[PDB]
Design a binder for this molecule. Structure first.
Ligand SMILES: C[C@@H]1CCC/C=C/C=C\[C@H](O)C[C@@H](O)C/C=C\C=C\[C@@H](O)C/C=C/C=C\C(=O)O1
Length: 359
């Protein structure tokens, strides 16, 4: 039925368990599906969030998704385009008057969705003493006080701040807070069971935490250095992230719950970057690849086993969602780790896609 070589499931499990036995990894969990039917799901290891008596890592365990929150932000922006409240060609300065200045006056909403607005990866937090980074207006004024890194449409550079701006734009046009909109129109609309901007106290002991820096961040009611939680701050689980990825693969709907039109998702899933533009990620050059409307189309093709057209996104944590429309295949994973190690985040993608057989 799923057309999958189960020997690669044993290889995938042994790959995660080996890193767990070696101390390179505390826990790991994944979930893969063919044609919308989950045929393999597993959680490995434990985590030290409860100090001693290590908490078992389960499939419904809650954990931050990091930059996967930006995928929720991209859906919200495109929902407002569907309603006629936003247009991707709108200059940001028409909504945020602080952008009415050289350089920033050319940034359109489309540039923020595709990381082509020239913004740097982050803002200098320790250099903004005496300003309230939680306030929207004072955060934007310090942002436009910062030099733009590249010109608009001149380079692809992943920017966390770019999607915080989108969350502010969502709030200014809808009249409700960003977190209020995403909760009603995406989280509840898609039927996400264990996805929260702020975990209720009854469920906090079911949240996986590997560093007490995350244990203290679980009890906060607002983002520490961002005016909103538009680029990171969501807590979720494998089943919910899998539902979100399957919504894109089915072009905007999941069973009876429709989040976007199928023509909207097609535009989000096609490449939006002009050819020949250089790609940068975290101060280092990155290989060029397709990037849609808030959705990543890379890695795919080339030497990778993922078919050309595979959309994805990664989140610090780490976590990730990968869906192959050509194979009706979706793979989501939780790999809690404090450093990025490609052997734990990217290498299992080779193991997983090597098991796909003829549908
Ligand atoms: C495919 C790429 C990511 C490939 C992996 C490269 C990692 C490079 C350097 C360090 O690990 C950086 C890491 O410590 C923390 C810094 C940024 C983390 C961002 C996460 O929210 C993942 C977001 C990826 C977005 C686009 C992309 O372009 O994803």
């Amino acid at each position: 039925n799923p057309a999958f070589d189960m020997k690669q499931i044993n290889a995938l499990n042994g790959h995660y368990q080996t890193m767990i036995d070696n101390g390179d990894l505390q826990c790991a969990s994944y979930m893969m599906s063919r044609g919308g039917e989950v045929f393999a799901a597993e959680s490995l290891g434990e985590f030290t969030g409860g100090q001693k008596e290590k908490q078992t890592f389960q499939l419904d365990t809650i954990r931050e998704i990091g930059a996967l929150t930006a995928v929720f932000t991209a859906v919200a922006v495109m929902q407002l385009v569907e309603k006629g409240l936003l247009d991707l060609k709108m200059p940001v300065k028409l909504i945020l008057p602080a952008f009415d200045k050289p350089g920033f006056g050319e940034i359109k909403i489309l540039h923020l969705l595709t990381h082509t607005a020239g913004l740097s990866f982050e803002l200098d937090i320790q250099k903004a003493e005496g300003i309230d980074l939680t306030n929207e207006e004072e955060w934007i004024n310090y942002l436009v006080s910062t030099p733009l890194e590249y010109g608009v449409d001149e380079a692809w550079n992943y920017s966390r701040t770019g999607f915080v701006i989108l969350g502010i734009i969502i709030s200014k046009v809808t009249g409700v807070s960003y977190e209020q909109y995403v909760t009603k129109h995406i989280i509840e609309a898609l039927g996400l069971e264990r996805t929260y901007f702020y975990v209720p106290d009854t469920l906090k002991e079911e949240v996986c935490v590997i560093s007490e820096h995350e244990c203290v961040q679980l009890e906060k009611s607002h983002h520490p250095y961002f005016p909103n939680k538009a680029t990171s701050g969501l807590y979720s689980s494998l089943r919910d992230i899998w539902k979100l990825a399957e919504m894109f693969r089915n072009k905007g709907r999941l069973k009876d719950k429709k989040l976007l039109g199928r023509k909207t998702v097609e535009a989000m899933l096609r490449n939006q970057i002009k050819p020949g533009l250089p790609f940068y990620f975290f101060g280092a050059p990155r290989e060029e690849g397709g990037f849609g409307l808030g959705i990543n189309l890379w890695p795919a093709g080339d030497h990778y086993f993922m078919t050309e057209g595979t959309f994805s996104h990664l989140g610090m944590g780490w976590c990730g969602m990968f869906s192959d429309p050509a194979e009706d295949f979706t793979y989501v994973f939780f790999t809690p780790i404090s450093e990025f190690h490609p052997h734990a985040v990217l290498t299992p993608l080779n193991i997983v896609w090597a098991g796909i057989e003829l549908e």
